[PDB]
Amino acid sequence: QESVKEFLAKAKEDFLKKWETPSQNTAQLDQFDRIKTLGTGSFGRVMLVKHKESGNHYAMKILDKQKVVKLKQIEHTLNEKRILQAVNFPFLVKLEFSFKDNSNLYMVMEYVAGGEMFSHLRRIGRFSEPHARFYAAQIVLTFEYLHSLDLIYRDLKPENLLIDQQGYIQVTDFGFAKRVKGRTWTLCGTPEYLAPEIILSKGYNKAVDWWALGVLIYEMAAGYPPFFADQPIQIYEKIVSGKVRFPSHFSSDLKDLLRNLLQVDLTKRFGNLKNGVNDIKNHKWFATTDWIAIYQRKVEAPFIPKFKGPGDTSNFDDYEEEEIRVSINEKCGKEFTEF
């Protein structure tokens, strides 16, 4: 209790220095050879690249400025980079470089070669409770860290969780991360993971991350989400109804934890009560969890992904490749001045 309090105080001091004076322009495009796409999204893609002078591999997120502007994502993109360059935690992907050119924004991260949790989860089907609990503990600690800095993460899902070479989680995709001391209103996230208060255009706070943790633990342990359908609208209807059914194999402890996380009533949702994150850490489902040992990465991982060597992408799906164009004219220069 005393060690954590001090740890968090120092962590905030470190974060605030970088939040106040962010790193900028720490590489350029011709310092890397682009190899293969690791994942695609609405504003661009993430590519495996090799840094020429070091020989190191990295994962380069490329965002088309014009697409960002068209989708009204300027502030979110500025949030993403400002926050990711300032944070430091064992389960958060490291931003190694960032820069921009006439056409694009670039965030170059450590390459996490084990692939998305998503792919392993879908292939294997579901994770056992101890396997799911190992991952869940890392997310609990990560949210304790992020929330202490007044950050809301807002996109927890297996697609945004990478497995590292030691079998631990690296959270990626800070696209919707935001530093906020009051409530906020943006409808964003991923449909299956949205808390009811997001859907109902209520203001909301960090409690939405704890709801999303409930969804993640359920999906990890069940192999499917607690609220699923063919279309987002049908998903939202189910979320707002709030009724959750559990697989026959779920432990009583798991069901109890999930009823308290997937709680529509904010005055009752775990992570949001007087005792905060401790209601979760002290829950019976987590009785076997050594929280400090997880933080220190001393716990044996349930699953260690296959790695053939540097640059191996076997743990990722293949994607269609596209030329990276850079116009001779600067696009959206003023908008992205601080990036």
Partner: peptide, 19 residues
């Protein structure tokens, strides 16, 4: 089964964010 209904649904692949 709930599993079968999920696997037959259109949202078993990677899910994009919404904004």
């Amino acid at each position: 089964t709930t599993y079968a209904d999920f696997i037959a649904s259109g949202r078993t692949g990677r899910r994009a964010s919404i904004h």
